[model samples]
Target: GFKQDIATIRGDLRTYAQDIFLAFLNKYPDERRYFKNYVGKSDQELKSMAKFGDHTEKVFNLMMEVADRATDCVPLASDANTLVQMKQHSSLTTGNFEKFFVALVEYMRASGQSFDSQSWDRFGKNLVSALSSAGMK
Candidate 1:
């Protein structure tokens, strides 16, 4: 397949996922499903699925996404943005969609990535449109 040409790039992602999965297993030995959930399925069902496909890249992507989704875990002072006084930032009262959107906007801003309200709104809408056409269901 295309692996012949892209093997150099494709190979690292799986190895990176495996490296993280090993660490996660060591740190949380009780959670068998932490990494395996992304790979294994019920024995009989996976045996059938194996006849149709490999999910290696899918598992790697899920692991990478799970790693990236960790919360700020602490307050981030983005760029040179100043706070003369600490302010209460609340998203709890916000709509569910807006709650995540707010997180995205803050992460972008914290990472020194500029994004305005209009661009952010369009980003969310375009994401919805793309997912709608993804044929996942």
Candidate 2:
């Protein structure tokens, strides 16, 4: 049910997530220190060594997964965030919402995935706000 809506955009969604995160890092380098252990030494680093891509995949997959399951959505995202927070990055824990939203909107445009724009847009922004509010800011 929800797959089709995201199907056209999922690939680009994942890419945008990573690129946007890197952009966030470029805009705020100190945040990279928390991610350096896995994300990569630099944005220059490709595929295998890069953790953001994997994270991006998981994120978009998670987004799609909970698309129909309304009740599960918040907890799923929040739980995922908590898991990521174990490493203790406040920016990710608290600052991630803004970054995620910006990247998602851009990808939605650049990738031309417009099948379910309205629902997704509403859900996406609300989801970010909810999870960020729940996070330990």
Candidate 3:
């Protein structure tokens, strides 16, 4: 069930990426500090930048990969290095990490995608656990 939802989301990853990123930044404006290059730019201007698009796609792709594996309820070791790198960044907070997924769920609902809430919650829990394991919190 969720795999099908994930597949549909993945098929239109670029579009969803842009929307989700905008939603995320809008909801948590403080998080914009992480995206130094896009600071001070308006939403429309941010969308027009190739840099914004590329990074959004990368972020969304990683999120999709996590969601895909979340279906199986497996631990995420493969991306541990990336998680560690993110943890190493001094500016990132556990709250910021949690809010990103919250923004994703908000976009999913706003864009009319169907998903099982339990599964999404499981994904969020597992991702937070993974981040905690990486010493992010």
For this target, which candidate reaches the highest TM-score against the unseen true structure?
Answer: 3
Q: How many clashing pairs per prediction, in order?
A: 0, 0, 0
TM-score of 3: 0.85
Model 1 RMSD, rounded to 1 decimal = 16.8
Give the backbone clash total of model 2.
0
Q: Where does model 1 exceed 4 Å of error?
A: 1-11, 33-56, 63-137
The models' CA-based lDDT, in order, is 0.35, 0.56, 0.74
Q: Tell me the lDDT of model 2 at 95.
A: 58
lDDT of 2 by residue, 3-75 (tens): 5655654657666556656655665666556665644565556445545577757765666655644552233
lDDT of 2: 0.56
- Candidate 2 Cα outliers beyond 4 Å, as residue runs: 1-3, 9-33, 38-44, 50-53, 71-94, 132-135
| Residue 106 in model 1: lDDT | 47
Candidate 3 — which residues are off by over 4 angstroms?
Answer: 71-74, 86-90
Models 1 onward score TM values of 0.25, 0.56, 0.85
lDDT string, candidate 1, 61-103, tens digits:
5323422332221112221011112122121122322334344
Give the C-alpha miss distance for residue 68 in model 3, angstroms: 2.0
